[PDB]
Amino acid sequence: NPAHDHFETFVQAQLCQDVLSSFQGLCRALGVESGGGLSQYHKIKAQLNYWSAKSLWAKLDKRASQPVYQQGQACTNTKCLVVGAGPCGLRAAVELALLGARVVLVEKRIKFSRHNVLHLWPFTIHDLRALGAKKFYGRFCTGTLDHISIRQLQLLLLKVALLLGVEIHWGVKFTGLQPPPRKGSGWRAQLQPNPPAQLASYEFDVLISAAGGKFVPEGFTIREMRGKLAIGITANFVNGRTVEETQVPEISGVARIYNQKFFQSLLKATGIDLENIVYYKDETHYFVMTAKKQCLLRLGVLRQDLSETDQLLGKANVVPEALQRFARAAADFATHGKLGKLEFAQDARGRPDVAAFDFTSMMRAESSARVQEKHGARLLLGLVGDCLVEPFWPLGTGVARGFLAAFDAAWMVKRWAEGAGPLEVLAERESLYQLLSQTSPENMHRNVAQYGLDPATRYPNLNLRAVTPNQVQDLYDMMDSAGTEELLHWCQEQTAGFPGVHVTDFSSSWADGLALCALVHHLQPGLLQGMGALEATTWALRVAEHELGITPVLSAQAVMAGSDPLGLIAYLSHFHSAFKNTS
Numbered sequence: 001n002p003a004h005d006h007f008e009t010f011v012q013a014q015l016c017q018d019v020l021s022s023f024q025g026l027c028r029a030l031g032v033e034s035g036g037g038l039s040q041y042h043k044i045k046a047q048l049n050y051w052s053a054k055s056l057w058a059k060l061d062k063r064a065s066q067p068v069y070q071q072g073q074a075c076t077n078t079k080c081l082v083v084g085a086g087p088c089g090l091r092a093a094v095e096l097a098l099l100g101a102r103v104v105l106v107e108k109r110i111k112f113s114r115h116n117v118l119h120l121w122p123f124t125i126h127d128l129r130a131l132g133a134k135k136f137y138g139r140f141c142t143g144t145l146d147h148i149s150i151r152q153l154q155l156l157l158l159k160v161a162l163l164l165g166v167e168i169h170w171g172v173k174f175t176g177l178q179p180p181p182r183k184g185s186g187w188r189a190q191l192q193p194n195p196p197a198q199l200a201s202y203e204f205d206v207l208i209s210a211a212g213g214k215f216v217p218e219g220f221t222i223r224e225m226r227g228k229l230a231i232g233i234t235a236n237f238v239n240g241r242t243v244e245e246t247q248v249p250e251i252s253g254v255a256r257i258y259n260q261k262f263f264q265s266l267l268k269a270t271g272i273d274l275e276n277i278v279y280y281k282d283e284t285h286y287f288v289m290t291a292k293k294q295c296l297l298r299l300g301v302l303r304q305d306l307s308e309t310d311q312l313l314g315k316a317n318v319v320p321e322a323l324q325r326f327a328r329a330a331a332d333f334a335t336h337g338k339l340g341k342l343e344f345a346q347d348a349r350g351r352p353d354v355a356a357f358d359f360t361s362m363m364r365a366e367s368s369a370r371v372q373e374k375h376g377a378r379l380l381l382g383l384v385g386d387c388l389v390e391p392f393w394p395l396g397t398g399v400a401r402g403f404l405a406a407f408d409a410a411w412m413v414k415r416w417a418e419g420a421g422p423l424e425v426l427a428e429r430e431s432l433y434q435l436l437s438q439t440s441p442e443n444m445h446r447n448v449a450q451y452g453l454d455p456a457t458r459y460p461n462l463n464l465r466a467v468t469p470n471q472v473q474d475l476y477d478m479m480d481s482a483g484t485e486e487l488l489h490w491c492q493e494q495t496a497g498f499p500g501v502h503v504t505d506f507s508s509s510w511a512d513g514l515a516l517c518a519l520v521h522h523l524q525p526g527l528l529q530g531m532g533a534l535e536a537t538t539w540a541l542r543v544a545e546h547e548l549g550i551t552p553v554l555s556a557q558a559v560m561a562g563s564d565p566l567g568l569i570a571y572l573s574h575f576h577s578a579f580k581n582t583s
């Protein structure tokens with residue numbers, strides 16, 4: 001039987017190319033075209049009615065039938081480009097596809113090559129337990145196992161995303177946005193190496209960027225923040241799965257709070273000074289440690305004391321042989337030798353798998369979402385995963401906060417598909433974003449099994465109006481109400497003839513306060529240089545109030561920052577209302 005011979009190969013595939021190989025071999029044996037969407041998910045399960053595999057269809061159909069998605073129609077008029085086939089990219093891709101949306105994902109690499117091990121919060125375990133991971137990965141969180149290697153997380157999620165009919169492409173980097181030439185024309189992706197001509201023509205109205213710690217799309221800004229110099233070191237050793245190795249208790253890291261006698265012993269015993277060390281028993285014996293610069297220099301792990309941290313941990317300044325020595329001795333002391341002699345696993349390049357990372361930064365994007373609109377054509381952009389907020393690896397928030405963000409973005413595209421105003425969608429979304437960087441299992445909802453896209457199911461005492469529509473206008477970039485153009489033409493008419501006033505808009509035009517003075521001076525002749533925009537703005541607001549009867553809608557600061565156009569429009573409307581030509 002050809003059918004689910006393929007399907008068993010597909011399920012147990014450990015290599016990206018083979019998952020891909022298998023699926024399109026399963027598809028051919030079924031008359032199903034790969035790239036989906038749900039319609040092709042349907043014909044797959046409806047033509048493969050074999051035991052052991054039904055367990056999986058039950059799990060997926062269980063999630064697929066829960067009200068939020070309705071029945072894959074919530075987002076049928078929604079077309080997405082998802083960037084990044086990382087875990088958060090795939091996890092979000094699955095939600096979009098379950099929502100019924102057309103999901104096309106682009107990934108720059110062609111293999112899952114990372115072997116570092118991620119901590120999984122209890123809810124993510126449930127979440128992907130119920131996506132059928134146990135079947136795609138036998139060792140998935142067996143017993144009290146709390147973690148999963150990056151590439152295994154990807155092998156799972158890929159298989160789920162493929163099944164659900166996500167059109168995925170490999171070996172193609174999203175470079176930027178190629179905007180609409182004209183109404184009716186949509187947004188497209190700039191891709192490279194320049195894609196096939198149908199991907200090239202693919203027009204979308206939602207972009208979800210899950211591209212990892214170093215790539216955010218245009219217009220998204222990054223708030224950088226740096227703590228004390230902090231050097232992270234990960235390492236993977238061959239885990240032979242002998243009974244002896246299997247008994248070595250793993251090290252959680254929370255012991256740095258409860259146990260510092262250890263770090264003293266480590267230091268005395270090896271000359272190694274760590275701030276923390278973590279050990280997970282996974283496909284490899286995984287260690288991540290945090291080290292003091294002084295310590296790494298003294299041990300010849302780093303060649304020279306370099307001030308620019310990116311050059312401090314550049315290839316030229318990291319001594320491979322000494323780093324290996326360093327990691328080996330630390331791993332060995334911490335597990336008291338019970339792992340036997342440690343042999344480095346290979347990384348994907350084929351090197352002893354040990355690397356140093358900058359752990360100093362606390363990056364967050366300023367917002368989780370924005371909306372661009374040109375020639376009436378709207379594009380919702382949503383951040384997910386490491387690119388949104390950077391995880392502190394020793395504390396294991398990466399998967400969980402990436403997943404929370406992926407649910408919040410799918411929830412966002414649901415509002416977007418309901419027809420909500422861009423400001424409303426953004427405000428709601430930024431209200432959720434606010435909570436992300438302080439989430440813990442402890443301050444979240446207790447019942448992880450009842451978790452769904454609805455943020456209420458996840459965040460206790462949820463305030464969906466923490467950020468208001470007025471506070472996210474700079475997130476809505478309208479670079480393309482007919483009463484606004486009346487107001488504008490009228491405002492321009494009033495302030496005409498003033499040296500260095502040129503009313504052009506309802507933000508930057510009015511920022512230095514001279515526009516306001518002109519308006520007032522014009523409206524009441526005979527009242528009253530180089531004081532700042534602050535004094536100009538202020539006089540105008542006081543004089544408007546007392547002479548013209550119009551109280552301030554915006555503060556002076558808000559006039560100068562120009563980030564509240566709607567409120568300036570409402571201010572100005574009072575002047576026009578008060579002094580319209582006639583009735």
Ligand SMILES: Cc1cc2nc3c(=O)[nH]c(=O)nc-3n(C[C@H](O)[C@H](O)[C@H](O)COP(=O)(O)OP(=O)(O)OC[C@H]3O[C@@H](n4cnc5c(N)ncnc54)[C@H](O)[C@@H]3O)c2cc1C
Pocket residue numbers: 083084085086087088089106107108109114116117118119150172173174175210211212213215234288384385386387391392393394396397398399402
């Ligand atoms: C080398 C490396 C080692 C790590 N080690 C640990 C660890 O030890 N412990 C821990 O807790 N976390 C670790 N992390 C972070 C962890 O991998 C992520 O939190 C987790 O995978 C979820 O992140 P993500 O999907 O948002 O981003 P990522 O995992 O970075 O995935 C981003 C995806 O986007 C692809 N991509 C990037 N740019 C583009 C582009 N322009 N166009 C198209 N595709 C693009 C990338 O190839 C990648 O596949 C590591 C990350 C990296 C990159």
Ligand SMILES: [Cl-]
Pocket residue numbers: 014015016017110111112113
């Ligand atoms: Cl692979």
